[PDB]
């Protein structure tokens, strides 16, 4: 089920990043390429990211600024942050934080004319999700559970 789920995880990442890019006027296309339908997982993740970024904006903005990104250091910075994020374990809130962090990195990369990073950040997120989070996700009910526990019927 690994890569039955690995194509799906890739699509979740692309959809979240495409949505965060679109909120600022950018587009994903410019920089490259169980019971609840995947459109609901996508929307619940979009929703959760929005509520996370809204409620923790200052703490989250301050933290996104403290790591000075360059195309030659971005990969190491991303992996180090994510290692620390999940050091003590995984819960759905940290996965939401993981997605919002990646989206924030994509948007900042475009702002600062580091657009080569946009598609790579997606690859790193999907690889980490597929290689290091999907076991927990599978063990914890799959994405059905995320929507059931954090879904909201107001978009």
């Amino acid at each position: 089920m690994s890569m039955a789920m690995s194509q799906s995880n890739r699509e979740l990442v692309v959809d979240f990043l495409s949505y965060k890019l679109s909120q600022k006027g950018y587009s994903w296309s410019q920089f490259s390429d169980e019971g609840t339908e995947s459109e609901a997982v996508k929307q619940a993740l979009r929703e959760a990211g929005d509520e996370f970024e809204l409620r923790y904006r200052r703490a989250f903005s301050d933290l996104t600024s403290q790591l000075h990104i360059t195309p030659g250091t971005a990969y190491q910075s991303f992996e180090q942050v994510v290692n620390e994020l999940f050091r003590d374990g995984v819960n759905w809130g940290r996965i939401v934080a993981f997605f919002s962090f990646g989206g924030a990195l994509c948007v900042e990369s475009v702002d600062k004319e580091m657009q080569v990073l946009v598609s790579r950040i997606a690859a790193w997120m999907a690889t980490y999700l597929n290689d290091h989070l999907e076991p927990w996700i599978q063990e914890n009910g799959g994405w059905d559970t995320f929507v059931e526990l954090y879904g909201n019927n107001a978009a």
Binding site: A48, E51, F52, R55, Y56, A59, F60, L63, T64, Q66, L67, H68, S77, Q80, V81, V82, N83, E84, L85, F86, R87, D88, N91, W92, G93, R94, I95, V96, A97, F98, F101, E148, L149, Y150, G151, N152
Partner: peptide, 24 residues
């Protein structure tokens, strides 16, 4: 160091999120 601290506050926020916006 920036990354380790950035990761820890992200974890803090995610844990707050997971409690706040739980609906079941």
């Amino acid at each position: 160091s920036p990354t380790s601290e950035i990761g820890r506050h992200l974890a803090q926020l995610g844990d707050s999120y997971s409690v706040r916006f739980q609906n079941e």
